[PDB]
Write a protein that binds this ligand. Structure first.
Ligand SMILES: Nc1ncnc2c1ncn2[C@@H]1O[C@H](COP(=O)(O)OP(=O)(O)O)[C@@H](O)[C@H]1O
Ligand SMILES: Nc1ncnc2c1ncn2[C@@H]1O[C@H](COP(=O)(O)OP(=O)(O)O)[C@@H](O)[C@H]1O
Ligand code: ICS
Ligand code: CLF
Ligand code: SF4
Ligand code: SF4
Ligand code: FES
Ligand code: FES
Ligand SMILES: [Fe+3]
Ligand SMILES: [Mg+2]
Ligand SMILES: [Mg+2]
Lengths: 121, 283, 522, 477, 121, 272
């Protein structure tokens, strides 16, 4: 899996290789590579690790499970439209915005954008 | 050689004035100090540069297009022999109000301003709320010693309790500790004792008591610090006294935050709040 | 450390002890250089017969080649016409290399321009470059004529010069009557001598063809001379002298000797002499056309024979004794003028020099490389001297040329050892001089590295280089010499015999070891 | 001085140009004002050359193959394409190396693909793969191969990256593809950038997981010195005498091992900013290695550079720096006492591309000579920011000067000496003006350091004061 | 070279492999793979092929030449800021917005975004 | 210096009204510059007496690029000392039709043609669509005052509503305001009160009413503006009243959009 990290705080976009499906999440890959996504909780409720994820290989999008905890936090931050909620519930397709501490790496190419601000502006 | 410092507190209690005067006092002892304004108001370098207002990082980054092209020399202004920077903030309503702090500290580290050519580095951080940007210096281990300006006001102590909650939250992954508590005179009779008790409840010390002096306004109109305006004044002596005990500070403790009820009972103890009773509720 | 009275350049300053210690530290500490025993073992392996068999099994890789690309020859041809700018359509990097190459050989200014094609021209073609370049060059340097050749970049993208030049005139960039001959000179076809042939044919076709019906053969009673790619200034002067001694009217076409030998008198002449356009228009009126270097003038021969209706004689390069005789007799028959006593005396002095030095020249083995016509004339002269060519190399030779050289070697007992190689580079020749050691090399200055290699193996394996050809970079003013005619043969003979005598003197200079043969009289 | 007639001079020269050419060439000529810090408001650089005006610029292939990659001695450099490009650039630039040519060093050799018409039409990558196998067979002691692509490679469509990856892993050896086609870029300047990127992307990060190199706190790497006439060897001895040990030389006498050991260095010493600032900025970003520009041209700039370098270390180095300054002090003072009286007050106009024009101004001033003209073939606007303070007031500045312009400027200023390249040498010698080759040092040198200042002073004196310059006019003329 | 095409008109982002340095531009790569970037000229003077380029491997950014023709067109559609014009002139680094018919593919990973509208909105 | 822009649907008299507007303005001695932002290049013919002023876009393509273009070759003075600029568009189907406006407006700032003590600058802008370079004056805060020329027709009123929607979108980011509704007559009954009804729906006062007559067409053959043709005419003074009402307009109000049915009800209740 190839992950491209992008942020205005970063002078250059960073390209990393990651093992898919690890118990350690996207937060693991970011922390091992010095990508400074703000992590401010250990229970997955603060929403400060909000990132925008783009599947660069659109043919290779993997079905996943959006847990009830991540879904509720995305609503509390506001980064979950009603159509994306229905898409996840019916088609098991990931939404545009994810929580990095709760995101499992899949076998594809990803673009991860964050602003350095916690979820909720 | 560098002692990274931050000053927190509620808006409008005198963080900038006390910080600029203490920093100006430090330069008298030959200390090289840098002031980083982490407040969206962006007036924490006014009395050092004698200017209208320092141009913020957000202003030059937008007027030039990005933060990459920003010269360090344009960003860092030297007045009174002490370097000055202002983070600024985004437009009110969009983004995170503390975004300027995140951008400024990141740019300063990349450009080399934070390198150890300075004895002291100070952050004037707004403490009316503890969120991303304003709590970023605590989270990212960028300010080892925190000093809280607090008055004898219910809101001022409430903010002081909130900032101490932020410090303990990150006390196990970094060296951020609570240096002390600065009391600024709100012209309140029991307030000097009130903050002494608050520091004992929090487990920290009252680093000083600053009395409300009208000579500060006479220096403020001049866009100048009190110590240079009137070195022989006693207000400059208190600021000098605060400066020595800041350097001589060694009690960097992890605070013990108190609850809302314990704050209220502490207010009623010193007579600012009256003694409440449960049988006088319906009338 | 320097002494102000004896200042040392790079040699031998870096032979000092402190520099020697510094260089020893550099390589031992960080270079990770192979052990010197390993380096010597690999070097010896490169001098063996098993390496040569591996060397000659090469297809894709060429090492140390002995040829340039076509537009270099096109610039040299264009420089031989009066007040003419060489113009190379393509990227500017070629022109900077072309000028530097000729600057180092002739030690003279070389004027050439480019239209500086870049990525936008790569995507959208280079028509706009032609329009602006033609106008800019005419206004600034004021040429009477602009001759246009092509870079490999313009050949790959299919830029056609005819439409571009025509569109430049109909849109007012240059006057419609301004002469702009052109030629396509792809660097992936042929070599620099081919580029000379292409440019000359384009200039010739530009003036004579539309006026062909009016022209009649022999009206002007002159003989056209086409020299070809010639980098010896004396070769131009000797042809003029021999024909003017015979009283023969002639027209040298593309003679650049004037612009390449301008005097230094406080003024820079950017143009000097050159053939006038008039002589090019009157060229089909000549009795005949003579090609001095036929083997790279083939495309010109077709145009002159087909269009001008001239019966071009089958002549070799006027090099040596026999071929200079044939050139003079053919010219005498065409022009109807007898060979005067001055040329008879000159020929007899060359024969006098040949018998004086034949003892030192007999049986010497020579390895030579160069352009086809130059190499063949050199081999023929070596046979007439009793010398033995052994390795004959021509990187830009073909099968027809190689067959003609073999027939020349067959007609002499001194060509038994000789073998002819086409398409081989100077790394092939380095193997040849190791496994089959000759006495001397004859070639350009790129052979100085082969002499350095042979000396490393040992003094008794060293093959000295004799500098005849193009380009010569490490010697001064050797471009002023002659290789054609009797005069050119005298100069070559003097160089050959005195190089043998110089080498023999060096080998017998050791006191009480070999100096018993250090003869005063040779 | 006299900026008013220089401004008038610029106008008269430009009257021959068409309106399109005259408008553009005006932006590239300027009168020097040392008070200006932003040259963008006085001169414009790094633009395309006007067609058909006899520019002196080269191509991107010259800037990459001929400048950056060529000096690397244990690597084999392939000129991919037709035969012309590698032949004209073979051994034409003097970079001094210590090796056995053809065995473990290959600097003066020309390896090429020799493209023919069939390679232009049918692919070209199968020949490249076959060529790499023959290089391994006949040159087994080589430590890497670089493919320097010429113009046709990108125009016909060829994938030299895949061949480098497939053959590199197969033979377990580094193959570096360089897309330095001549039509890319406007001059040699982009060739440096392309070559630097290839070093960064294929060579520099090789020894990242390795930690078996023993590094001292005094590790320095030379960057941007190509050992022209042994220039980098003269510079290295002064740094070594100062206590510092230099792991890498970029790229004169350079080896593939030194380049890979560079990220294990404490200080990057950059001599040529133009050609190697790209890789030094990358190294400061990735490995946190600081870098600075130094100047070893003449004693005044050499002492200033030696002290600045020593200021980045402890006080043992600075004491050692004072020793080498005192040791060499009588040497260059005896040189000045011998040669300055002969050279005092004479005017020199210099036209060289990128670093040398601004760099040589101090050494000329160390001999009492004044630089009337400074020009660059391919400098950017940051290079012109660096030279306006070095040049005197009201002095001519030119950028990408044409052949016509330079001749007109010289015959009006009438300098006592001109320093330029080979393409200009013989023009101004017919005009009776002494000329020194400032690229190749006229096959002399070195000129760096204290050892090179003696040679530099002798060279300028031998040419400017030569008896031949008084005989240009015949006595009956 | 790996190129990821992205557009609101495209249902999925398309990933392609391309040969760097070809005379056929990114316009060539798009047309072989059926990516509908609007191409409405053959002289490179319209702005119709305007695309946004993101260098995903920020370390592997290649220096290039911003042609005067492309520079003027990008300014005619208001897509070349002064800071990016200065960066191209001094550092030879590509601007954010490019013309696909004039963009040469380099040996890196790129994300190409277009809206289906000509340059100049 | 006051920067104004004339917006409106194609064919309602947008050009001739603007030409006669500044013809009257220069009669007061004011220095006014005209910038034609219409792909049709007849926006300045009646103040220059020319067949077709050479557009900046045509000149750049012919003479290489816009860098080689000279200010004198694009800025021509006419009657009254009015500075005249014409920016054409590209050919149909070749890119955005509005690139001409972006190139010209940027070119004029770069050469500094505004600072020369100009009083009024007028942009005659296509209003059929609000996008690309046609919306550029509103987008980049180029024209602070905007006047819509409209008539009592669905398309003319629909165009006026669309421009007002554009003003609202960019109101917060710059001082671009709706100034008034210039109304021209196609000789239809109850047109003065109809457009006034639309104006007070917006909350922006109508500037003046322009009736139709043949005097402007006699001037059109001349290529000379009505004011300069015959200053004593009825309409000649009528543009004077329209010019006077423009220079002395002190109220600028942000517009509020009107829905389709609301506009349809407005048109229907007028008996049309
Ligand atoms: N030591 C002091 N004595 C009297 N007034 C003071 C003192 N320090 C600050 N003030 C007044 O308090 C006001 C707000 O202080 P300021 O430093 O702006 O608050 P903040 O902490 O929000 O920066 C100022 O107008 C100043 O005049
Ligand atoms: N005040 C007027 N009275 C009568 N006819 C007019 C008046 N104004 C314009 N017209 C006519 O209406 C047409 C409008 O075209 P014009 O104003 O030239 O361009 P635009 O389409 O930009 O409005 C013109 O042909 C003109 O004859
Ligand atoms: S690399 Fe450059 S043109 Fe810095 S391409 Fe050129 S051996 Fe010059 S002024 Mo020849 S930027 Fe080197 C140069 Fe200077 S070849 Fe040498 S002398 S210091
Ligand atoms: S700009 Fe540069 S030097 Fe020029 S070709 Fe291009 S890469 Fe090369 Fe070599 S082969 Fe001859 S000289 Fe050229 S025309 Fe074809
Ligand atoms: S984190 Fe705090 S400062 Fe940032 S947007 Fe949220 S509330 Fe505002
Ligand atoms: S924005 Fe408007 S003018 Fe531009 S292309 Fe689209 S419809 Fe045409
Ligand atoms: S770190 Fe708090 S929700 Fe992810
Ligand atoms: S298709 Fe017109 S500029 Fe690319
Ligand atoms: Fe000469
Ligand atoms: Mg404040
Ligand atoms: Mg109109």
């Amino acid at each position: 899996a190839t992950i491209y990290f992008s942020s205005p705080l970063m002078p250059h976009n960073k390209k990393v290789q990651a093992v898919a499906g690890k118990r350690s999440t996207l937060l693991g890959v970011a922390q091992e590579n010095g990508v400074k996504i703000p992590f401010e909780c250990q229970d997955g409720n603060c929403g400060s690790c909000l990132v925008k994820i783009t599947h660069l290989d659109g043919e290779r999008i993997k079905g996943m499970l959006l847990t009830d905890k991540e879904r509720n936090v995305l609503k509390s931050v506001g980064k979950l439209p009603k159509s994306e909620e229905e898409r996840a519930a019916v088609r098991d397709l990931p939404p545009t915005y994810r929580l990095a501490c709760q995101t499992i790496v899949t076998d594809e190419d990803l673009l991860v954008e964050f602003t350095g601000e916690p979820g909720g502006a | 050689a560098m002692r990274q410092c931050a000053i927190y507190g509620k808006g409008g209690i005198g963080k900038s004035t006390t910080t600029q005067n203490l920093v100006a006092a430090l330069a008298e002892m030959g200390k090289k100090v840098m002031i980083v304004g982490c407040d969206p108001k962006a007036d924490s370098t006014r009395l050092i540069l004698h200017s209208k207002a320092q141009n913020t990082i957000m202003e030059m980054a937008a007027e030039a297009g990005t933060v990459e092209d920003l010269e360090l020399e344009d960003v860092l202004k030297a007045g009174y022999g002490v370097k000055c920077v202002e983070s600024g903030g985004p437009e009110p309503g969009v983004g995170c109000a503390g975004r300027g702090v995140i951008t400024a500290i990141n740019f300063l580290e990349e450009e080399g301003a934070y390198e150890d050519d300075l004895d002291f580095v100070f952050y004037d951080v707004l403490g009316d709320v503890v969120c991303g940007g304003f709590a970023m210096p605590i989270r990212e281990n960028k300010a080892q010693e925190i000093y809280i300006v607090c008055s004898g006001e219910m809101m001022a102590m409430y903010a002081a309790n909130n900032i101490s909650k932020g410090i303990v939250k990150y006390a196990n992954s970094g060296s951020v500790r609570l240096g002390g508590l600065i009391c600024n005179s709100r012209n309140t009779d029991r307030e000097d004792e009130l903050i002494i008790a608050l520091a004992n409840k929090l487990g920290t010390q009252m680093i000083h008591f600053v009395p409300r002096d009208n000579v500060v306004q006479r220096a403020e109109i001049r866009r100048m610090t009190v110590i240079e305006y009137d070195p022989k004044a006693k207000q400059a002596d208190e600021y000098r006294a605060l400066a020595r005990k800041v350097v001589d500070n060694k009690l960097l403790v992890i605070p013990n935050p108190i609850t809302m009820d314990e704050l209220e009972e502490l207010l009623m103890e010193f007579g600012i709040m009256e003694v409440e009773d449960e049988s006088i509720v319906g009338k | 450390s320097q002494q102000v009275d004896k200042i040392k350049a790079s040699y031998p300053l870096f032979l000092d002890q402190d520099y020697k210690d510094m260089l020893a530290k550099k390589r031992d500490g960080f270079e990770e250089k192979y052990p010197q025993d390993k380096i010597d073992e690999v070097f010896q392996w490169t001098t063996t017969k098993e390496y040569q068999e591996l060397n000659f099994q090469r297809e894709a890789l060429t090492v140390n080649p002995a040829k340039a690309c076509q537009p270099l020859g096109a610039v040299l041809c264009a420089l031989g016409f009066e007040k003419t700018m060489p113009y190379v359509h393509g990227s500017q990097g070629c022109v900077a290399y072309f000028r530097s190459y000729f600057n180092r050989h002739f030690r003279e200014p070389v004027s050439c321009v480019s239209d500086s094609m870049t990525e936008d021209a790569a995507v959208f073609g280079g028509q706009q470059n032609m329009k602006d370049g033609l106008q800019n060059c005419k206004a600034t340097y004021k040429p009477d004529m602009i001759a246009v050749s092509t870079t490999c970049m313009a050949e790959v993208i299919g830029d056609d010069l005819n439409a571009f030049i025509n569109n430049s005139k109909k849109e007012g960039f240059i006057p419609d009557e301004f002469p702009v001959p052109f030629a396509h000179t792809p660097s992936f076809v042929g070599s620099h001598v081919t580029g000379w042939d292409n440019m000359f044919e384009g200039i010739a076709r530009y003036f004579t063809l539309k006026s062909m019906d009016d022209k009649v053969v022999g009206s002007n009673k002159k003989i056209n001379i086409v020299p070809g790619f010639e980098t010896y200034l004396g070769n131009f002067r000797v042809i003029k002298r021999m024909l003017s001694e015979m009283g023969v009217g002639y027209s040298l076409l593309s003679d650049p000797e004037e612009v390449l030998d301008t005097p230094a008198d406080g003024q820079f002449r950017m143009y000097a002499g050159g053939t006038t356009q008039e002589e090019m228009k009157d060229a089909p009126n000549a009795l005949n056309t003579v090609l001095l270097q036929p083997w790279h003038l083939e495309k010109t021969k077709k145009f002159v024979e087909g269009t001008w209706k001239h019966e071009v004689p089958k002549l070799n390069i006027p090099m040596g004794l026999d071929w200079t005789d044939e050139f003079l007799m053919k010219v005498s028959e065409i022009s109807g003028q007898p060979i005067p006593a001055s040329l008879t005396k000159e020929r007899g002095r060359l024969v006098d020099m040949m018998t004086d030095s034949h003892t030192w020249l007999h049986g010497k083995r020579f390895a030579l490389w160069g352009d086809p016509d130059f190499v063949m004339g050199l081999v023929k002269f070596l046979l007439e001297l009793g010398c033995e060519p052994v390795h004959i190399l021509c990187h830009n030779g073909n099968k027809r040329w190689k067959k003609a050289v073999d027939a020349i070697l067959a007609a002499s007992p001194y060509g038994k050892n000789a073998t002819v190689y086409i398409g081989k580079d100077l790394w092939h020749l380095r193997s040849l001089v190791f496994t089959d050691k000759p006495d001397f090399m004859i070639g350009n200055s790129y052979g100085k590295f082969i002499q350095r290699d042979t000396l490393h193996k040992g003094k008794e394996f060293e093959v000295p280089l004799i500098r005849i050809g193009f380009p010569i970079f490490d010697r001064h003013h050797l471009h002023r010499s002659t290789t054609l005619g009797y005069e050119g043969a005298m100069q070559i003979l003097t160089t050959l015999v005195n190089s043998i005598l110089e080498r023999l003197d060096e080998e017998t200079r050791g006191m009480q070891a070999t100096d018993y043969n250090h003869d005063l009289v040779r | 001085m006299s900026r008013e007639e220089v401004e008038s001079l610029i106008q008269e020269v430009l009257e021959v140009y068409p309106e399109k050419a005259r408008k553009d060439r005006n932006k590239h000529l300027a009168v020097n004002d040392p008070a200006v810090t932003q040259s963008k408001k006085c001169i414009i650089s790094n633009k395309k050359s006007q067609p058909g005006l006899m520019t002196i610029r080269g191509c991107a292939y010259a800037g990459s193959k001929g400048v950056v990659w060529g000096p690397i001695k244990d690597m084999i450099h392939i000129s991919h394409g037709p035969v012309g490009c590698g032949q004209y650039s073979r051994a034409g630039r003097r970079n001094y190396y210590i090796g056995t040519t053809g065995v473990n060093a290959f600097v003066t050799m020309n390896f090429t693909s020799d493209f023919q018409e069939k390679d232009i039409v049918f692919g070209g990558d199968k020949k490249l793969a076959k060529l790499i196998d023959e290089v391994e067979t006949l040159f087994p002691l080589n430590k890497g191969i670089s493919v320097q692509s010429e113009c046709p490679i990108g125009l016909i469509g060829d994938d030299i990256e895949s061949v480098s990856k497939v053959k590199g892993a197969e033979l377990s050896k580094t193959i570096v593809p360089v897309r330095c086609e001549g039509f890319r870029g406007v001059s040699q300047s982009l060739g440096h950038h392309i070559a630097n990127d290839a070093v960064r992307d294929w060579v520099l990060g090789k020894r990242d997981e390795d930690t078996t190199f023993a590094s001292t706190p005094y590790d320095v790497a030379i960057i941007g010195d190509y050992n022209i006439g042994g220039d980098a060897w003269s510079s290295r001895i002064l740094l070594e005498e100062m206590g510092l040990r230099c792991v890498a030389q970029w790229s004169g006498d350079g080896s593939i091992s030194e380049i890979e050991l560079t990220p294990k260095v404490k200080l990057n010493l950059v001599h040529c900013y133009r050609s190697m600032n790209y890789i030094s900025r990358h190294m400061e970003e990735k490995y946190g290695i600081p870098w600075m520009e130094y100047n070893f041209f003449g004693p005044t700039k050499t002492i200033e550079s030696l002290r600045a370098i020593a200021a980045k270390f402890d006080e043992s180095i600075q004491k050692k720096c004072e020793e080498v300054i005192a040791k060499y002090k009588p040497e260059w003072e005896a040189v000045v006492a011998k040669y300055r009286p002969r050279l005092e007050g004479k005017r020199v106009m210099l036209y060289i591309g990128g670093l040398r024009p601004r760099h040589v101004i101090g050494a000329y001033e160390d001999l009492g000579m004044e630089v009337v003209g400074t020009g660059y073939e391919f400098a950017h606007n940051d290079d012109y920011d660096r030279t306006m303070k070095e040049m005197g007031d009201s002095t001519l500045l030119y950028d990408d000067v044409t052949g016509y312009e330079f001749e007109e400027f010289v015959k009006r200023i009438k300098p006592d000496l001109i320093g330029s390249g080979i393409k200009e040498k013989f023009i101004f010698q017919k005009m009776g003006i002494p000329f020194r080759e400032m690229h190749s040092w006229d096959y002399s040198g070195p000129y760096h350091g204290f050892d090179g200042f003696a040679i530099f002073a002798r060279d300028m004196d031998m040419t400017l004061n030569n008896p031949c310059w008084k005989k240009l006019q015949a006595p009956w003329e």
